[PDB]
């Protein structure tokens, strides 16, 4: 067998359908999340194939769950649609029940709950979709960034890479970014999300999408010009680097 | 593993069940329809498979509505359930929403929809038959149609199905004319069907009915001008004979 269903525990304590769901994620687009001290940047690789594709009418890879909680996603887009709709409906329901806006923790734990439920049954497979859920707490400033997996495990991570060739981005993110001292400014934060994505695109500022979430129900999605200005500043500091090695070699 | 459910597909597409379903159609007897500019003639044969078996207890030509008849080609038993359902839905879906007997295109779709549900489920075989449904309404005129095992339908000028399909198809192409009357169609129908068995032909072994003009005779009642008799008519055994003498 023993990979033929979820109702087979397997002779190794692994659920193969959870394992193969994970393998599914890799096929989708790269996504990176980085917290500041007064922001979260939620950034994603934006796929291209043709210049006959619209961007006018077509969904972004980022979807507003409410108004202070946001979501980016990686995996099959088809699968993810249903994930995103449920996450949203519940976030509005939360104010039907309590009269509060949603907490960040409440939401991620719920979206993993919905997959976990699916995983538990044998009739239905779980979705092959990993999300990063970014947001700020109801009345407070304290940036929050969270991860979900198809298994139905959720975690907090300061910064995170998911999607295509996650590991190779991850290592770079680790080195430059610190837990001890995260980016000063929203501006500096965004550029760090750009460095990470630059690698995975090859060439581009047009296959890089940037969005920002800040406290107090502030979500803004940054214009394409401003991304072009940033990819060019990263290439300008990078050129300074090449040379600085040449100078150091001449001196010594 | 590719061919052995309705739920499974192949690396060449489709389902095994539709290809096999098509095969079921061709095992049946030859049944044919020719559309004329004032009518449609529908014809089938009956193979008794014993002299003991009666020819009239087999009903291979069935009124769906009294404006729309059908025949089939394929497996005999499957036909019987589908006709009972076809009537049953004919009245439900569009005689309490429309309150009069359905237009030809509509019922074609409703009958087609049952076939579609019988493909849709995993664990439920598709029908053994493909029907021809010929009918009349005012709005789209006389018309003639094919409902294939898939759940899919096609309007036709003339077509044939069953075992005698390759000989009949090539005859129907050559011999159709731009304009033709019903009466002339009866003779073209008869000649085509005789290809399929020789020396066992005659108006008792051949079932023939039409959706032609109304017959206020067989309406059952009189003195109400707004309504019309049935467009459908079953030709008797003596009437088939008259038409056969004239060839």
């Amino acid at each position: 067998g023993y990979d033929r269903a979820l109702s087979i525990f397997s002779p190794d304590g692994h659920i193969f359908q959870v394992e193969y769901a994970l393998e599914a994620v890799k096929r989708g687009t790269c996504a990176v999340g980085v917290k500041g001290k007064n922001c979260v940047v939620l950034g994603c690789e934006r796929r291209s194939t043709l210049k006959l594709q619209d961007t006018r009418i077509t969904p972004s890879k980022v979807s507003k769950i409410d108004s202070h909680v946001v979501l980016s996603f990686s995996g099959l887009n088809a699968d993810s649609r249903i994930l995103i709709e449920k996450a949203r409906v519940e976030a509005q329901s939360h104010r039907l029940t309590l009269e509060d806006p949603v907490t960040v923790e409440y939401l991620t734990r719920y979206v993993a709950g919905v997959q976990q439920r699916y995983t538990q049954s044998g009739g239905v497979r779980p979705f092959g979709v990993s999300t990063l859920i970014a947001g700020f707490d109801p009345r407070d400033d304290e940036p929050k960034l969270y991860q979900t997996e198809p298994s139905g495990i959720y975690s907090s991570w300061s910064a995170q890479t998911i999607g295509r060739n996650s590991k190779t981005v991850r290592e770079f993110l680790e080195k430059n970014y610190d837990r001890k001292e995260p980016p000063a400014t929203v501006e500096e934060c965004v550029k760090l999300t750009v460095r990470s994505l630059l690698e995975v695109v090859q060439t581009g500022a047009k296959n890089i999408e940037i969005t920002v979430v800040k406290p107090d129900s502030d979500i803004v999605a940054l214009s394409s010009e401003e991304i072009n200005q940033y990819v060019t500043q990263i290439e300008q500091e990078k050129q300074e680097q090449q040379e600085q090695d040449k100078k150091k070699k001449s001196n010594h | 593993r590719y061919s052995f459910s309705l739920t499974t597909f192949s690396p060449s597409g489709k389902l095994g069940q539709i290809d096999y379903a098509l095969t079921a159609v061709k095992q049946g007897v030859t049944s044919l329809g020719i559309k004329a500019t004032n009518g449609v003639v529908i014809a089938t044969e009956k193979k008794s498979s014993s002299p003991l078996a009666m020819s009239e207890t087999l009903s291979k030509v069935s009124l769906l509505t009294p404006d729309i008849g059908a025949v089939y080609s394929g497996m005999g038993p499957d036909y019987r359930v589908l006709v009972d359902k076809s009537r049953k839905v004919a009245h439900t879906s569009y005689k309490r929403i429309y309150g009069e007997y359905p237009p030809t295109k509509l019922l074609v779709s409703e009958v087609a929809k049952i076939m579609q549900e019988a493909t849709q489920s995993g664990g439920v075989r598709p029908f053994g038959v493909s029907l021809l449904i010929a009918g009349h309404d005012e709005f789209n005129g006389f018309s003639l149609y094919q409902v294939d095992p898939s759940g899919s339908y096609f309007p036709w000028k003339a077509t044939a199905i069953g075992k005698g399909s390759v000989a009949a198809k090539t005859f129907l192409e050559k011999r159709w004319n731009d304009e033709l009357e019903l009466e002339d169609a009866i003779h073209i129908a008869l000649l085509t069907l005789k290809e399929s068995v020789e020396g066992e032909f005659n108006g008792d072994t051949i079932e023939l009915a039409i959706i032609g003009d109304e017959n206020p005779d067989l309406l059952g009642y009189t003195g109400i001008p707004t309504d019309k008799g049935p467009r459908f008519r079953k030709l008797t055994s003596q009437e088939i004979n008259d038409r056969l003498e004239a060839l």
Partner: protein, 241 residues
């Protein structure tokens, strides 16, 4: 193998069943939607013909969804039947509720979700039909989308589904012009169907065609399915016949 259920994934981390359904759409004919700022042309191919085939009194790769959205059909027609009927019902359910015609984007979204559900749940077959949607709603003007069998959607300025997709796409993007004209788009479509389809003559009775235009009044959109004899006049103009 891992065709065996639809609710199981392959160790590769694809789903063979869906992939297989995607190959279902390459046993049916081409369908082309091109959006232009001056209209959308919807074009479809009839993959079956004969000389006794009645095809001149019928539309069957052009179905009107409401009064302002229409689709072209590529794939199984039995598959198509059930989802078109459902879509028509939901789009106009929106009309009742909100007293406005359905936005193009929401109705595609609704319908793509239902596709994902047939793979996600039960032991049902996924549906191997790719629909090119063309509508008009005030919030983004002319809107064009097309749907995959997987259950997802992407916007386009032109797209091709059906058979010989890879070739057809090549031909379109070579000859596209960003402003375009509604007339030049029709002409582009015919040029392309001609080459992918093996019916060299490419006659009227083998073509279905629909154009969506706002030219009827202003603020009011008129969806006009081209009728057979009309399809024959525009082949003379493009020179094909």
């Amino acid at each position: 193998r891992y065709d065996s259920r639809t609710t199981i994934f392959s160790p590769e981390g694809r789903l063979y069943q869906v992939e297989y359904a995607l190959e279902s759409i390459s046993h049916a004919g081409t369908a082309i939607g091109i959006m232009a700022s001056d209209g959308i042309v919807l074009a479809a191919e009839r993959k079956v013909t004969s000389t006794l085939l009645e095809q001149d009194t019928s539309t069957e790769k052009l179905y009107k969804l409401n009064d302002k959205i229409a689709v072209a059909v590529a794939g199984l027609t039995a598959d198509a039947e059930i989802l078109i009927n459902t879509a028509r019902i939901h789009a106009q359910n929106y009309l009742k509720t909100y007293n406005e015609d359905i936005p193009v984007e929401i109705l595609v979204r609704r319908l793509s979700d239902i596709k994902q559900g047939y793979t996600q749940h039960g032991g049902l077959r996924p549906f191997g039909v790719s629909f090119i949607y063309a509508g008009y709603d005030d919030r983004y003007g002319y809107q064009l989308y097309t749907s995959n069998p997987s259950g997802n959607y992407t916007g386009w300025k032109a797209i091709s589904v059906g058979a010989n997709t890879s070739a057809a796409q090549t031909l379109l993007q070579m000859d596209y012009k960003d402003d375009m004209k509604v007339d030049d788009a029709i002409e582009l479509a015919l040029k392309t169907l001609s080459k992918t389809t093996d019916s060299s003559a490419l006659t009227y009775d083998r073509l279905e065609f629909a154009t969506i235009r706002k030219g009827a009044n202003d603020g009011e959109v008129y969806q006009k399915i081209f009728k057979p004899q009309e399809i024959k006049d525009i082949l003379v103009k493009t020179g094909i016949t």
